[PDB]
């Protein structure tokens, strides 16, 4: 179901992201709740500071630590997860 | 036509933000081109590192430097501009 659009992040950290986002959707309906759930696992598992954008239509321009960015689709939802700060 | 939902930044930096989004929309259509224009201006004006999301349907959970975050609607889009790293 996952579709990785773009990434700069180890293939296993990526799987981790997608597992996390799958969990998040089993548990949360509305974008802000999903995002906050994904973000917090990653600060916890891979250290702060991470940022997550969840929605059905957005664009972005961000700066991320090298090797810590993932942008993907998990159905009609697009997830952006990256680390900066 | 700007409507400021949430913010943590000087009223004067909010105006600036909006003026910058306004300029961004006069010359860009594509959500990621809008975002990048704004992001790069704030890096220039207020130093790195900023992140900007431009979208009609998204949510997010991010961390930002105190006094440097704004989320607002302009036109038919929602803008998130914040600094982190």
């Amino acid at each position: 179901k996952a579709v990785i659009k773009n990434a700069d992040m180890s293939e296993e950290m990526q799987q981790d992201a997608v597992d996390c986002a799958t969990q998040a959707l089993e548990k949360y309906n509305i974008e802000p709740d999903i995002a906050a759930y994904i973000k917090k696992e990653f600060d916890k598992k891979y250290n702060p500071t991470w940022h997550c954008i969840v929605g059905r239509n957005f664009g972005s321009y961000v700066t991320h630590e090298t090797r810590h960015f993932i942008y993907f689709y998990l159905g009609q939802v697009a997830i952006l997860l990256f680390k900066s700060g | 036509k700007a409507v400021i939902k949430n913010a943590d930044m000087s009223e004067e930096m909010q105006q600036d933000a909006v003026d910058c989004a306004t300029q961004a929309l006069e010359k860009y259509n594509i959500e990621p081109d809008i975002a990048a224009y704004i992001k790069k201006e704030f890096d220039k004006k207020y130093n790195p590192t900023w992140h900007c999301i431009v979208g009609r349907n998204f949510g997010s959970y991010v961390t930002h430097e105190t006094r440097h975050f704004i989320y607002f609607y302009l036109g038919q889009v929602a803008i998130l501009l914040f600094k982190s790293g």
């Binding site: 239509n57 321009y61 961000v62 700066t63 991320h64 | 590192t49 979208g55």
Partner: peptide
Amino acid sequence: PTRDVATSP
């Protein structure tokens, strides 16, 4: 250790 990237819907 940093990169700038755009995402598209």
